[PDB]
Design a protein around this motif. Structure first.
Motif, short mmCIF file in Angstrom:
data_model
loop_
_atom_site.label_atom_id
_atom_site.label_comp_id
_atom_site.label_asym_id
_atom_site.label_seq_id
_atom_site.Cartn_x
_atom_site.Cartn_y
_atom_site.Cartn_z
N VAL A 21 -5.34 2.69 -5.80
CA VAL A 21 -5.15 2.95 -4.37
C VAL A 21 -6.24 2.26 -3.56
O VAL A 21 -5.98 1.68 -2.50
CB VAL A 21 -5.12 4.46 -4.11
N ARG B 66 -5.96 -0.31 -0.31
CA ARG B 66 -6.58 -0.05 0.98
C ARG B 66 -7.51 -1.19 1.38
O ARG B 66 -7.53 -1.61 2.55
CB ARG B 66 -7.34 1.27 0.93
N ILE C 48 -6.43 6.63 -9.16
CA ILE C 48 -6.97 6.49 -7.81
C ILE C 48 -7.58 5.10 -7.62
O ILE C 48 -7.65 4.60 -6.49
CB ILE C 48 -8.02 7.59 -7.55
N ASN D 256 0.76 9.42 -5.88
CA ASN D 256 1.10 10.81 -5.61
C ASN D 256 2.06 11.34 -6.67
O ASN D 256 1.90 12.47 -7.15
CB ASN D 256 1.71 10.95 -4.22
N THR E 85 2.11 1.82 -3.52
CA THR E 85 1.07 2.25 -4.45
C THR E 85 0.66 3.69 -4.20
O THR E 85 0.45 4.46 -5.15
CB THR E 85 -0.14 1.32 -4.35
N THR E 86 0.52 4.08 -2.94
CA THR E 86 0.13 5.46 -2.65
C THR E 86 1.21 6.44 -3.07
O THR E 86 0.91 7.50 -3.64
CB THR E 86 -0.18 5.62 -1.16
N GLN E 87 2.48 6.12 -2.80
CA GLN E 87 3.55 6.98 -3.28
C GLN E 87 3.51 7.11 -4.80
O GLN E 87 3.64 8.22 -5.34
CB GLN E 87 4.91 6.44 -2.83
N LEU F 164 0.83 -1.20 0.00
CA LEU F 164 0.00 0.00 0.00
C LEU F 164 0.86 1.25 0.00
O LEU F 164 0.54 2.23 -0.68
CB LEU F 164 -0.94 0.02 1.21
N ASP F 165 1.94 1.25 0.78
CA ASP F 165 2.82 2.41 0.80
C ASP F 165 3.36 2.70 -0.59
O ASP F 165 3.34 3.85 -1.06
CB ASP F 165 3.96 2.19 1.79
#
Lengths: 54, 49
Positions: free
Chosen positions: A47, A51, A44, A38, A33-35, A30-31
């Motif tokens: 993400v 989650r 989206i 961004n 993918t979110t980075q 998850l870290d």
């Protein structure tokens, strides 16, 4: 009955350890993918999948 | 591709790449136009004889 009850506890211990390892791996996913979202390489929608898995 | 980008339902890199492709295609068309003009400068008389 005593023998079965004894072995079930060790089974639970093993399951708990491996589930914790899976949790660590999915959190790192998850870290990443979110980075990446961004920075502007993924949408989206990806993400939300991470989650949900977390 | 553009309208989907207005909402956040498409990667920004992909839209950037689409824009870049449009620009490159325009430039190459300009190259072809200039080549055609270059050849035309020798036969602008419009009469074979």
């Amino acid at each position: 009955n005593t023998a079965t009850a004894y072995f079930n506890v060790l089974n639970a211990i093993d399951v708990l350890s491996y589930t914790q390892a899976q949790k660590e791996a999915i959190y790192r996913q998850l870290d990443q993918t979110t980075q990446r979202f961004n920075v502007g390489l993924v949408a989206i929608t990806d993400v939300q999948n991470a989650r949900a898995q977390y | 591709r553009v309208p989907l980008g207005n909402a956040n339902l498409i990667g920004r890199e992909e839209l950037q790449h689409a824009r870049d492709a449009v620009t490159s295609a325009q430039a190459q068309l300009d190259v072809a136009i200039q080549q055609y003009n270059a050849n035309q400068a020798m036969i602008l008389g419009t009469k074979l004889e």
